[PDB]
């Protein structure tokens, strides 16, 4: 649901927020992902 | 077989500060 605030349980990682398209150059090994304060900010949908 | 290499080094437990580039890539690192 890329644009509506949602409770997510992505691979055990529970939390709440919104999901939008991202161009993060996640080289093909980068997964959970985070930010400057090291807080999960970008999860590559494992299925897609 | 059929018919100038072997560069070996040993790593150590050290603290490093790594400079990341905008595309997620490591441009420079400094050994504290």
């Amino acid at each position: 649901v890329k644009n509506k605030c949602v409770n997510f349980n992505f691979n055990g990682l529970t939390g709440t927020g919104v999901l939008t398209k991202s161009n993060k150059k996640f080289l093909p090994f980068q997964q959970f992902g985070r930010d400057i304060v090291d807080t999960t900010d970008a999860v590559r949908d494992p299925q897609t | 077989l059929n018919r100038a290499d072997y560069y070996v080094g040993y790593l150590q437990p050290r603290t490093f500060l790594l400079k990341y580039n905008e595309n997620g890539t490591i441009t420079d690192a400094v050994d504290c």
């Binding site: 993060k24 150059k25 996640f26 080289l27 090994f29 980068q30 997964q31 959970f32 992902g33 985070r34 400057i36 090291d38 970008a42 | 072997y6 560069y7 080094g9 790593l11 490093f16 790594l18 990341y20 580039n21 905008e22 595309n23 997620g24 490591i26 420079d28 690192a29």
Partner: peptide
């Protein structure tokens, strides 16, 4: 056979410690 000459490594041998994207 082989030789065992020494060589400075300079700034070399740095790998991504984990798989987390980081920018700036």
């Amino acid at each position: 056979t082989t030789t065992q000459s020494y060589t400075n490594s300079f700034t070399r041998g740095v790998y991504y410690p984990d798989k987390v994207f980081r920018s700036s």
